[PDB]
Write a protein that binds this ligand. Structure first.
Ligand SMILES: Nc1nc2sc(CCCCc3ccc(C(=O)N[C@@H](CCC(=O)O)C(=O)O)s3)cc2c(=O)[nH]1
Ligand SMILES: Nc1nc2sc(CCCCc3ccc(C(=O)N[C@@H](CCC(=O)O)C(=O)O)s3)cc2c(=O)[nH]1
Ligand SMILES: NCC(=O)N[C@@H]1O[C@H](COP(=O)([O-])[O-])[C@@H](O)[C@H]1O
Ligand SMILES: NCC(=O)N[C@@H]1O[C@H](COP(=O)([O-])[O-])[C@@H](O)[C@H]1O
Lengths: 200, 200
């Protein structure tokens, strides 16, 4: 399965995916890294790994559909089979999500359905949970509401901040994201016809 | 700390609390078990342990306030310090919750704030999470929205039903409920003046 990874920043999840897809038994290969923001560290990680990169400045487009259309063009150019959102911080339009239904994965730093949105750690700390975690899910049009592939719980420690909590959760992200991608790339897991997750 | 345990059924959480409060280092003692339903197994467990029991048939009262008033009478009779809701399946009125603010704990079979309400396992299975768990929290007037004391994650296995999931989650309930009660009974944890959880 040919994979695109979309990023918006540091790219630690990208790095974990790169590392896992170079294992001999990987069923996925990363053929392109796309960022909506220039000069982010994730682009350096891609380039160090010899992976092509494209920057698509969402700010330069009329609307979400035209921006996504530019992404879709690159995905078609590289004959992509699966899209991983790895720290990608832009909401995708409906028809783009529809097109890639069952082929696009996202990592989210909470145990969905808790704490949807862009500041999950902040919500988790404000709420006072002692257990949080991360989730890989299929992207459906409804944000952070697609079919869940894998999750891993992570403890919250007293005195945790976004900094320290996000560090602990990322160690879990870097395990379940590569594992989830392998499950989808190998055909072990798919979206079923009833739209829910099917273990083949 | 003198403890009342309120139940509505089988009483496995009650049994775990009984067992823990008989350890020499327990800071809690269970002085009364109250059920809103007759002939449930939790009443047999209490009686086998030599603990007084009272049945208060909510159906026999005019409204929630009068019913809670009957509970409160028993709590005062037994000079109770802390109330544990252990499978108690009745919503408590506002003034009763206010009175026992910071003194009443509840066990809920999900990782709050996910899956509030009476059918948490059903919701967890319908949603498709691969990680669920249980939560002990202080009871605030807003249902399943008081301050979280402890939580424990529990995996969901493929093919799980309410039966098999609830069995696995209960093993975790029987650990964190006794632990949470010990934290409150020993004064290690309280509701702070800002209303949030304070570790002393
Ligand atoms: N349809 C659909 N799309 C997506 S995308 C995705 C992965 C990331 C989700 C996390 C985010 C939540 C809110 C964000 C936001 O408000 N972003 C702004 C500003 C950013 C900028 O500076 O540009 C923007 O989008 O304008 S990002 C999941 C997902 C999905 O489930 N469904
Ligand atoms: N204010 C306040 N009260 C409470 S109680 C509690 C522990 C249990 C919560 C789980 C439940 C959710 C909904 C229930 C329900 O609909 N029960 C019906 C029918 C039962 C019957 O047959 O009688 C009834 O209450 O009439 S039970 C937590 C809690 C809290 O957080 N805040
Ligand atoms: N809702 C999306 C979201 O919050 N994504 C989060 O951004 C971080 C990206 O780190 P990275 O750039 O080092 O992979 C990750 O923690 C990811 O879960
Ligand atoms: N929202 C409350 C709720 O769902 N309570 C749940 O009822 C069960 C009682 O079992 P038990 O009678 O064997 O303790 C427990 O699983 C508890 O978490």
């Amino acid at each position: 399965a040919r994979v695109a990874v979309l990023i918006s920043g540091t790219g630690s999840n990208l790095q974990a995916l790169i590392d896992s897809t170079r294992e001999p038994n990987s069923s996925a290969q990363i053929d392109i890294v796309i960022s909506n923001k220039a000069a982010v560290a994730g682009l350096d990680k891609a380039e160090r790994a010899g992976i092509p990169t494209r920057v698509i400045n969402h700010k330069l487009y009329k609307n979400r559909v035209e921006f996504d259309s530019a992404i879709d063009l690159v995905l078609e150019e590289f004959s992509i089979d699966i899209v991983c959102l790895a720290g990608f911080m832009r909401i995708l339009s409906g028809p783009f999500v529809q097109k890639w239904n069952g082929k696009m994965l996202n990592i989210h730093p909470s145990l969905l359905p808790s704490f949807k949105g862009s500041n999950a750690h902040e919500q988790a700390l404000e709420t006072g949970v002692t257990v949080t975690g991360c989730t890989v899910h299929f992207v459906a049009e409804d944000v952070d509401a697609g079919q869940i592939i894998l999750q891993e719980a992570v403890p919250v420690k007293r005195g945790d901040t976004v900094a320290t909590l996000s560090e602990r959760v990322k160690l879990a992200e870097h395990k379940i994201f590569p594992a989830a991608l392998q499950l989808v790339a190998s055909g072990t897991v798919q979206l079923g016809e009833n739209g829910k997750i099917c273990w083949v």
